[PDB]
Ligand binder design. Structure first.
Ligand SMILES: Nc1ncnc2c1ncn2[C@@H]1O[C@H](COP(=O)(O)OP(=O)(O)OP(=O)(O)O)[C@@H](O)[C@H]1O
Ligand SMILES: Nc1ncnc2c1ncn2[C@@H]1O[C@H](COP(=O)(O)OP(=O)(O)OP(=O)(O)O)[C@@H](O)[C@H]1O
Ligand SMILES: Nc1ncnc2c1ncn2[C@@H]1O[C@H](COP(=O)(O)OP(=O)(O)OP(=O)(O)O)[C@@H](O)[C@H]1O
Ligand SMILES: [Mg+2]
Ligand SMILES: [Mg+2]
Lengths: 70, 403, 87, 413, 247, 232, 233, 253
């Protein structure tokens, strides 16, 4: 108890994202380092769908970033 | 006056045979006949007896003197015979004159007092200020059940009958020894084992003014309104004649007290304290008897369960063998069972089978019957219900640990 | 800061809230202070009046050191009963 | 393979079954249901508009005299006076919740009859002053006096002699005989808080005192001490103590003070805020830079551990009294007291039931004496017997409603 | 010190050994081991949980350990806990051989180990052996046999059983489709493969994630073998064809 | 060497760990033993045959000696251990006293073993209650019950484990010299008692019988079925 | 937490206090010392009619002149009885005499409270014995009656009752006992008090009675004798 | 799901559209239906279906919506809900994920949630209490059937408990067809293999394989998804994290 509250928040998020409302118009973007530790309900389709990898920069990436920042 | 306002019900003296039969037809016809007779007579005598010289000119005078939109206000320290102080809903202390129509008696401090709108003047007394949130807890359409509907709970029914019915049925039996009749029984037991059924049974043959509560509706959001709704409830109970108040699901306002840190879990504690104080404290308690139902008797704060406030703790258990067959008989009657669906078999097997389970098996059994297009239940229609009603339950020890 | 009466503060308070009784000179206020620890001030006024209360209850004229001691045991609600074991 | 149900299927199902007179039965039942509504509608709830004195006892005056009462005698509004400018007829008043004002004194009332702090009858329209109003005595505050004598004497409070003597030493003697407390000059302890397990007579002794208080015994209905609007509770307690300091030897009982008192904290919603404020006002009144006087406080609780320290310390409550479970003699006396009105056989040994009811309380002793003749009423006798009482004990306490230790459990011999 | 003590061997308020039943929960997650007793031999089949392109193939098995010339067992739990018990079993068997100059009966060997397991549950303050074993063997007293044990130190003989992940599903299938007293070794292998197929929900039997051993008496001498890849694959092909024929 | 005080008094005068072990004895199976005029019978209600389990290795009745046997109800592993210690002691007494052990003596030893496990350091109370029957040298039949508490007693009959009290009440009202008049009546007496607890009957209760001279005998399923039919 | 050897704010051991409390649960036992001898009685408290009342032995013999009555954890009483018997025989073997009642009790008491947890022994006792022994016997000093509480405290007493009815059994013993009482008078008075405290009607099957006299050895009354006394009592 | 749909219809349709039949059979009308389910395999779609096909008067309640900070406001809302339902004749309430006002009663004190417990109690009483609600039916859907309380799952409040299983292969083919009948499939798009390529799917991942396929199609600004497109979509959708550091996996073995 009092730790069930995080569960309540997650459940409300799941309901709003895909529940008996089908908002349709609104999109949702979430960011969280590490995705292995997540609820499968919030990871399945019909919810946050496309998982985008944001890797540590490669050799080419470093060059482009250094150019654009200096 | 202490009016013993009954449930204002029982308009169905109860048709004796339940099997569709001309006996049923004739009896219900007699019922309708008397009802129509009553309607006719009342209408006819209302129309006849030309007392049209009514209104008792004088009462018309009184109504004339007490204008339109009269206001409800709280009487206060009464100053003089022909003068008193009133407090309107805004809490403004006007100084009004008690007119002659008001009986100088019955007007005590704190009694809601009617007023004239323009010139604040005590015009009449009001003896019905029951909180509109409390009057909604008086049962006025008695639930349709009888002690015979419930089965297999003899010992556990006689105990309630000896503290909700007999004490007002033959009270000489009690005084002859001088023992004060037991007041307040807590019906604790596992889920779906009666409890509410016995409550409704005792409601039926009430002979009293049953008050129903919820166990959560008492809790209120305004500091103090909690420990005043209960006060109003029991004030109404004692004002009305012998009554039994069923505080169902007392597990809600009953949690063992603790040195808390929140505010809500202190207001609830204050509510329980009000309950305790009034049920057994400096005061008394007339013919008011309290029935409490709970699923967990171990959680109730020791206090609300004490042998001076809640005696005769009944122990409604999971139904036993014979009681199971009795309940099946009582809950399978009004169905056209086949000749090979004797229930003497579905009993046994699982050691966990409650009355709610039994009624579910009996209902999802007829529903199963209405799937092969038949209206006579079948043994397969019953053996296919144990696998569809009783499921999802937890299990026990791993075989091998013991035999 | 008003820290709890250590032991000499306790003795002095016991004396101060007294001297309106027929107290006998034979009372080791230091030993009383030793016995009474964590007693927050007015807890004396309590104890150093309950002493006289008990003295009156018994039927007597003068306060006694054991009277003070019984008052001390009393002011904590504790009760002294001769136990059946000491071995 | 569960094919649905077709409309024709339902139609046939509704008509293949024994209903010789069943359509009529349902129709007549519906007619009865619709007829009850008509009957009650036409005999609805009336004759409930009471509040009318019988214009027969004063029937003669119950007439135009009333109108004469109306019209003249303008209805005034209550209000206090915060100043009265000397030699200047102007006054300043604070009505109550509306606002303040400057008022002139009506000619009908001499200025001397009107003072500072008294309640004036200001009129509407132009706020002028008229017949002054006597000091208020609030209804909630005045509805607390015992004004009766509950039917419980000290004798019936059995099983505890030391406790009763302790209580008497502070609640009765220090007021009914000041002599003993002067010869020694011992300040009578004031403030007795009663502990005890749930149900031991803590309220029984409080009631017993009321039968010989020979003074006011205001009973604090703690639930009333808390109200919605802030400051209401503090004012309630202040008026309580102010009426306290108006008579001789007033005793004020705070039954179940756990409701109003509790450890302070600012974590959860700042604590109760208002409730804690009322508790603080009570503490200040009990002890502070304003000597109380001749008012004593008795309070009872089930758990003293949950009381605010500033209230458990001496000064506010001196004579703490344990109310422990009765001893053997206590139990015997308690049984005797709650058995003297029972049709019990003479040969009953009550010294044995006492042993057979260990660690029980007074409420349990009652629930055993009762529910003892209840088995006799079940057997339809008239004089209960020792066997009946013993069965009652075994069915009430010790084993009460749950006896798990039974199957081959005889290890204590 | 009292404060840091764990109190592993103490009774739960309702009459239960928490560390014991818990230790059984740990055994629910282990690799699936399936043993079937036939009229001619006994067989153990174990789901090979470890399968990776880099693990090398070492030893004659990874879960099937030989105890005597006429015994073998499979484990399901912690190898560190399992390796301790396997070593003790071999010592117990050889100690009996030294004393009596006759191979230890299967029932007695199981009882000896089960006696050790009970001890850890009673005293010492040490955590229970969270390992469950299936023993197969032959002896002159009762012929072919199959036994099971649990961290509770309790054991029982069976004609076919499984332990580990999806045990319940296997025993159900085994209970339904086991022919007591008329099952040859081949049918036992076929039943094992079928039970293994459904039990591994993850993927299907590739003939590598399964290791099978069979105990048989040949020329008066007990023979313990671990089926090679060729026959394991051959069995798998045979089962697949049978499934197709049914459908 | 772990030497912590596992079982230690608690307010109001009780030993928790002893109580808790007692419930563990309750949750077990139901076992019933009766002392006849010249026969002592034990029975047990089997939770589940399981249709695969080999009934040989799940015997819950065993012989401590040629003239002593027992039945238990509780943790199996605790039961197997206790039986081994009793068996070795029986041989040791035979070695020294040169006479067969007595039911009273072995009961005292087993009881003394349990008593040493509650009070000891770093140990757990044995989770079994044992019913010991046997014929002493004089021939008088004997029946003894031992609880985990170490207390042992002599009975005409009693029942342990799940469904104990109800069965015992059945035994109390139905036990008589007439019921103990004949060996068959004793055996049927047992079965009805178990049937008071077990449901299936005939196939769910294992029965054993000990006579004055003959050693322990386990009734065959056919014999149990025959007796059940006779009762019906 | 709260080791067995712990001190309360009053200086009271927790375990010793609890153990003494457990005594109350046990059945009643009455022991009266008289110049003619020492008598013991007890309540058997039969749990169920099936149980054989012969196997509930509440009065045992330590030697030919020493007897004991028990109450409390009867399982705990067993080890205490065994130590007493061994000590008695060891004393006879070495000194060729009979140990006095006080000496035996002192030996038994020295066993009570010899418990610990750390650095005590491989299998030492952890907790205190919850049983109250009434030692009675005849020595060179004449009849002797010693009561022992769980605290290891033994103190000769003229008449005492232990058990659930101790409070009130003692009270009755107070009103009747006197120095010149004879053995028969002690036996009857003991039987009455046991009858009063015993809920169930007192008969010959539910009470164990024994006596030790200067002439005779320890004697446990048989059913025939027990019936005779209760017939008049 | 077709058996499940029929089962739910027998409790939300039959006893409300054809009342007399139940009385004629002499049985008590059912009330209540709880739907289990793996992460996502239905629910909240049969819910909309029953809302969109039945002219009763659907009344929604989310999970964390009856929870109100002020004490008691979390029960007055439920009482008002049921009063409104009774005022609105045939009605059905689909309590969505209901672990929120649910779970199992915790021992009280300052060591757990209590006000949510009181709301659960109020709902329980109003579902089956002193008054027998008539013509009101409740639908409750919530994962983790094993965490609910022993009361809300007592046969008599939640009568029949539909079990939603993860789709079989035959059902997965149906799901793919139903959620693909708006996409221009090419010639040779063998849905059978594409369905059998998804073992133990969720029935919502089917609409990841049938949507990320079109998302692939968008990249080539074309239409006519192809079989390689669907295969890539399945490989891109059904990628569970798995495990690493075989030491932990090598811990049970
Ligand atoms: N022994 C019984 N005989 C007849 N009906 C029974 C019996 N036990 C249960 N029932 C039926 O079970 C149904 C479920 O409601 P019931 O009043 O029994 O629940 P309850 O025990 O009050 O439940 P709760 O634990 O939720 O308060 C009732 O309609 C009642 O008629
Ligand atoms: N020692 C006693 N002697 C006689 N009667 C007693 C004794 N103790 C309790 N009672 C009886 O117990 C009954 C119930 O007591 P009651 O619950 O009103 O008060 P209380 O024990 O102070 O408890 P509470 O904590 O609820 O205030 C009283 O009517 C009283 O007669
Ligand atoms: N059989 C099916 N056919 C088609 N679509 C389906 C099927 N089953 C589920 N879906 C899809 O599932 C999606 C909704 O997910 P779901 O029904 O599992 O929600 P939910 O029950 O609220 O789940 P959760 O348990 O995660 O809260 C919809 O996009 C719907 O198309
Ligand atoms: Mg109600
Ligand atoms: Mg009180």
């Amino acid at each position: 108890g009092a730790d069930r509250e995080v569960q309540r928040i997650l459940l409300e998020l799941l309901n709003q994202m895909d529940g008996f409302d089908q908002n349709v118009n609104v999109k949702v973007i979430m960011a969280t380092n590490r995705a292995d530790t997540l609820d499968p309900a919030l990871l399945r389709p019909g919810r946050l769908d496309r998982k985008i990898e944001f890797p540590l920069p490669d050799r080419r990436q470093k060059r482009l970033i250094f150019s654009t920042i200096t | 006056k202490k009016t013993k306002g009954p449930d204002a019900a029982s308009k169905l003296p109860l048709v004796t045979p339940h099997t569709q039969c001309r006996l049923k037809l004739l009896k219900l016809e007699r019922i309708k006949d008397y009802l129509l007779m009553e309607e006719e007579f009342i209408r006819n005598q209302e129309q006849m007896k030309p007392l049209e010289e009514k209104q008792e000119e004088e009462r018309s005078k009184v109504d004339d003197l007490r204008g339109t939109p009269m206001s409800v206000g709280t009487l206060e320290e009464i100053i003089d015979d022909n003068h008193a102080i009133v407090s309107t809903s805004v809490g403004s202390e006007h100084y009004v004159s008690i007119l002659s129509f008001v009986d100088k008696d019955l007007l005590e401090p704190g009694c809601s007092v009617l007023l004239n709108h323009k010139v604040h003047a005590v015009i009449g007394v009001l003896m019905d200020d029951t909180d509109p949130l409390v009057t909604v807890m008086k049962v006025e359409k008695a639930p349709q059940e009888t002690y015979a509907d419930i089965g297999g709970l003899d010992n556990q029914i006689q105990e309630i009958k000896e503290s909700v019915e007999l004490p007002l049925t033959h009270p000489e039996y009690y005084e002859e020894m001088g023992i004060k009749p037991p007041k307040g029984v807590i019906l604790y037991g596992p889920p779906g084992t009666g409890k509410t059924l016995l409550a409704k049974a005792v409601a039926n043959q009430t002979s009293a003014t049953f008050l129903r509560v919820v166990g959560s509706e008492l809790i209120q959001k305004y500091l103090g309104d909690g420990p005043k709704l209960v006060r109003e409830l029991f004030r109404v109970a004692e004002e009305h004649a012998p009554s039994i108040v069923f505080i169902d699901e007392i597990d809600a306002i009953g949690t063992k007290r603790y040195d808390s840190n929140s505010g809500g879990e202190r207001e609830i504690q204050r509510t329980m304290l009000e309950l305790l104080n009034q049920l057994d404290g400096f005061d008394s308690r007339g013919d008011v008897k309290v029935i409490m139902a709970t699923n967990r008797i171990e959680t109730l704060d020791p206090a609300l369960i004490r042998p001076g406030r809640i005696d005769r703790k009944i122990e409604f258990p999971l139904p036993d063998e014979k009681t199971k067959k009795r309940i099946f008989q009582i809950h399978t009657s009004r169905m056209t069972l086949a000749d090979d669906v004797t229930l003497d078999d579905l009993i046994m097997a699982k050691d966990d089978l409650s009355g709610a389970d039994i009624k579910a098996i009996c209902t999802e059994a007829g529903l199963m019957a209405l799937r092969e297009r038949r209206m006579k239940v079948t043994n397969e229609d019953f053996k296919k219900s144990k696998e569809n009603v009783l499921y999802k339950k937890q299990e026990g020890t791993p075989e091998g640990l013991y035999l | 800061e008003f820290p709890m009466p250590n032991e000499e503060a306790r003795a002095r308070i016991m004396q101060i809230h007294s001297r309106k009784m027929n107290v006998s000179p034979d009372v080791n206020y230091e030993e009383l202070a030793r016995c009474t620890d964590d007693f927050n001030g007015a807890q004396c006024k309590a104890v150093c009046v309950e002493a006289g209360m008990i003295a009156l209850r018994r039927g007597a004229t003068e306060l006694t050191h054991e009277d003070y001691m019984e008052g001390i045991l009393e002011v904590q609600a504790k009760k002294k009963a001769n136990l059946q074991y000491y071995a | 393979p569960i094919r649905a149900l077709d409309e024709g299927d339902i139609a046939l199902l509704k008509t293949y079954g024994q209903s010789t007179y069943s359509r009529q039965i349902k129709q007549v039942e519906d007619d009865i249901q619709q007829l009850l509504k008509k009957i009650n509608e036409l005999t609805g709830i009336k004759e409930s508009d009471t509040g009318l004195a019988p214009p027969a006892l004063w029937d003669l005056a119950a007439d135009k005299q009333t109108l004469q009462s109306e019209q003249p005698l303008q209805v005034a509004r209550c209000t206090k006076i915060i100043n009265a400018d000397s030699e200047d007829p102007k006054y300043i008043i604070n009505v109550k919740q509306f606002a303040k004002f400057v008022v002139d004194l009506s000619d009908q009332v001499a200025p001397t009859d009107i003072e500072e702090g008294m309640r004036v009858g200001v009129d509407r329209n132009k706020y002028q002053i008229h017949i002054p109003l006597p000091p208020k005595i609030d209804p909630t505050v005045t509805m607390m006096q015992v004004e009766e004598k509950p039917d419980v004497t000290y004798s019936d409070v059995g099983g505890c002699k030391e406790q009763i003597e302790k209580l008497r030493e502070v609640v009765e003697t220090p007021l009914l005989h000041p002599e003993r407390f002067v010869n020694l000059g011992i300040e009578p302890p004031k403030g007795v808080l009663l502990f005890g397990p749930p149900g031991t007579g803590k309220t029984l002794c409080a009631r017993a005192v009321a039968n010989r208080t020979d003074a006011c015994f205001i009973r604090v209905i703690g639930s009333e001490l808390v109200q919605k609007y802030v400051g209401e509770g503090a004012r309630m307690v202040r008026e309580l103590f102010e009426m306290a300091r108006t008579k001789k030897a007033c005793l004020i009982f705070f039954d179940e003070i756990d409701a109003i008192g509790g450890a302070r904290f600012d974590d959860g919603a700042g604590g109760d805020n208002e409730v804690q404020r009322t508790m603080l006002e009570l503490i200040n009144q009990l002890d502070g830079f304003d000597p109380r006087g001749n008012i004593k406080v008795l309070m009872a609780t089930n758990r003293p551990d949950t009381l605010d320290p500033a209230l458990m310390r001496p000064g506010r409550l001196d004579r703490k009294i344990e109310f422990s479970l009765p001893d053997l003699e206590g139990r015997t006396h308690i049984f005797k007291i709650h058995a003297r009105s029972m049709s019990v056989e003479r040969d009953i040994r009550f010294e044995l039931l006492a042993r057979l009811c260990p660690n029980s309380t007074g409420a349990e002793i009652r629930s055993v004496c009762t529910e003892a003749g209840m088995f006799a009423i079940r057997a339809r006798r008239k004089i209960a017997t020792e066997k009946d009482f013993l069965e009652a004990v075994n069915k009430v306490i010790k084993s009460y409603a749950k006896f798990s230790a039974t199957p081959r459990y005889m290890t204590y011999n | 010190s009292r404060r840091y003590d764990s109190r592993t061997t103490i009774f739960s308020p309702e009459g239960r050994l928490y560390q014991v039943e818990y230790a059984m929960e740990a055994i629910g997650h282990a690799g699936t081991c399936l043993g079937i007793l036939a009229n001619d031999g006994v067989l153990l089949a174990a789901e090979r949980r470890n399968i990776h392109k880099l693990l090398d193939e070492v030893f004659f098995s990874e879960k099937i350990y030989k105890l005597n010339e006429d015994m073998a067992c499979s484990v399901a739990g912690i190898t560190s806990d399992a390796n301790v018990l396997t070593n003790e079993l071999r010592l117990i068997a050889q100690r009996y051989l030294l004393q009596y100059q006759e191979p230890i009966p299967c029932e007695q060997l199981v009882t000896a180990l089960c006696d050790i397991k009970q001890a850890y549950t009673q005293f010492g303050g040490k955590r229970p052996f969270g390992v469950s074993l299936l023993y197969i063997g032959w002896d002159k007293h009762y012929g072919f046999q199959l036994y099971q044990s649990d961290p509770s130190g309790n054991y029982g003989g069976w004609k076919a059983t499984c332990i580990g992940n999806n045990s319940a599903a296997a025993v159900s299938m085994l209970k339904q489709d086991y022919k007591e007293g008329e099952m040859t070794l081949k049918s036992a292998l076929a039943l094992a493969i079928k039970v293994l197929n459904k039990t591994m929900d993850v993927s299907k039997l590739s003939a590598e994630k399964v290791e099978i051993a069979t105990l048989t008496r040949e020329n008066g001498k007990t023979v313990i073998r671990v089926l090679k890849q060729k026959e394991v694959e051959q069995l798998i092909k045979k089962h697949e064809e049978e499934e197709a024929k049914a459908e | 060497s772990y030497d912590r005080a596992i079982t230690v008094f608690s307010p109001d005068g009780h030993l928790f760990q002893v109580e808790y072990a007692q419930e563990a004895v309750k949750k077990g199976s139901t076992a019933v033993g009766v002392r006849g005029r010249d026969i002592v019978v034990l029975g047990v209600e089997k939770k589940s045959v399981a249709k695969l389990q080999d009934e040989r290795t799940v015997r819950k009745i065993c012989a401590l000696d040629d003239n002593v046997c027992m039945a238990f109800a509780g943790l199996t592993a605790d039961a197997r251990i206790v039986i081994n210690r009793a068996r070795v002691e029986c041989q040791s007494h035979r070695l020294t006293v040169e006479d067969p052990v007595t039911v009273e003596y072995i009961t005292r030893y087993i009881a003394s073993l349990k008593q040493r496990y509650t009070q000891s350091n770093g140990r757990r109370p044995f989770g079994i209650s044992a019913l010991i029957v046997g014929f002493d040298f004089d021939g008088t039949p004997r029946l003894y019950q031992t609880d985990p508490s170490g207390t042992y007693h002599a009975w005409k009959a009693n029942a342990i484990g799940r469904g104990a009290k109800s069965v015992r009440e059945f035994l109390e009202k139905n036990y008589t010299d007439e019921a103990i008049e004949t060996d068959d009546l004793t055996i049927k007496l047992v079965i009805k008692a178990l049937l008071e607890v077990v449901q299936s009957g005939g196939k769910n209760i294992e029965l054993a019988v000990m006579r004055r001279d003959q050693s322990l005998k386990i009734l065959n399923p056919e014999e149990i079925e025959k007796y059940v039919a006779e009762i019906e | 937490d709260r080791g067995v050897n712990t001190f309360s704010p009053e200086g009271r051991l927790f375990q010793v206090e609890y153990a003494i409390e457990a005594i109350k649960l046990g059945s009643t036992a009455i022991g009266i010392q008289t110049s003619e001898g020492v008598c013991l009685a007890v309540e058997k408290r039969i749990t169920s009619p099936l149980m054989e009342p012969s196997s509930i032995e509440k009065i045992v013999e330590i030697d030919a002149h020493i007897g004991c009555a028990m109450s409390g954890l009867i399982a705990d009483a067993k080890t205490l009885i065994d130590k007493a018997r061994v000590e008695t025989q060891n004393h006879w073997f070495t000194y060729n005499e009979t140990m006095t009642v006080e000496s035996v009790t002192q030996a038994v008491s020295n066993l009570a409270l010899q418990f610990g947890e750390e650095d005590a022994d491989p299998g030492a006792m952890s907790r205190p014995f919850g049983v109250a022994l009434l030692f009675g016997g005849v020595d060179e000093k004449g009849p002797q009656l010693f009561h022992m509480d769980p605290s290891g405290t033994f103190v000769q007493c003229d008449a005492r009752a232990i058990g659930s009815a101790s409070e009130g059994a003692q009270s009755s013993l107070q009103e009747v006992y006197h120095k010149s009482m004879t053995l028969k008078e002690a036996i009857k008075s003991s039987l009455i008090i046991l009858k009063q405290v015993m809920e169930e009607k007192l008969n010959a099957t539910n009470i164990e009675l024994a006596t030790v006299q200067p002439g005779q050895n320890f004697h446990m009354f048989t059913k025939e004798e027990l019936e005779e006394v209760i017939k008049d009592i | 799901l077709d058996k499940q749909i029929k089962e739910i219809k027998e409790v939300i349709e039959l006893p409300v559209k054809h009342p007399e039949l139940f009385e004629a059979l002499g049985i008590a009308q059912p009330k209540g239906v709880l739907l289990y389910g793996p992460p996502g395999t239905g629910k909240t779609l049969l819910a909309r279906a029953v809302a969109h096909h039945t002219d009763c008067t659907f009344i929604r309640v989310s999970g964390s919506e009856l929870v109100q900070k002020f004490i008691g406001e979390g029960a007055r809302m439920v009482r008002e809900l049921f009063v409104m339902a009774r005022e609105h004749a045939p009605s059905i309430i689909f309590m969505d994920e209901i672990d929120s006002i649910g779970s199992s009663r915790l021992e009280g004190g300052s060591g757990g949630d209590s006000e949510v417990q009181r709301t659960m109690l109020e709902l329980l009483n109003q579902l089956d209490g002193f008054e027998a609600t008539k013509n009101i039916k409740v639908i409750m859907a919530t994962n983790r059937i094993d965490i609910l309380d022993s009361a809300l799952l007592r046969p008599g409040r939640i009568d029949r408990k539909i079990e939603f299983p993860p789709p079989n292969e035959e059902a997965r083919l149906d799901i793919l067809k139903i959620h693909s009948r708006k996409m221009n499939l090419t010639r040779g798009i063998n849905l059978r293999k594409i369905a059998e390529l998804m073992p133990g799917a969720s029935g919502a991942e089917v609409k990841g394989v049938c949507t990320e396929a079109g998302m692939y199609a968008l990249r080539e600004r074309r239409v006519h998804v192809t079989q390689e497109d669907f295969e890539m979509a399945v490989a891109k959708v059904m990628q569970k994290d798995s495990e690493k550091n075989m030491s932990i996996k090598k811990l049970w073995k």
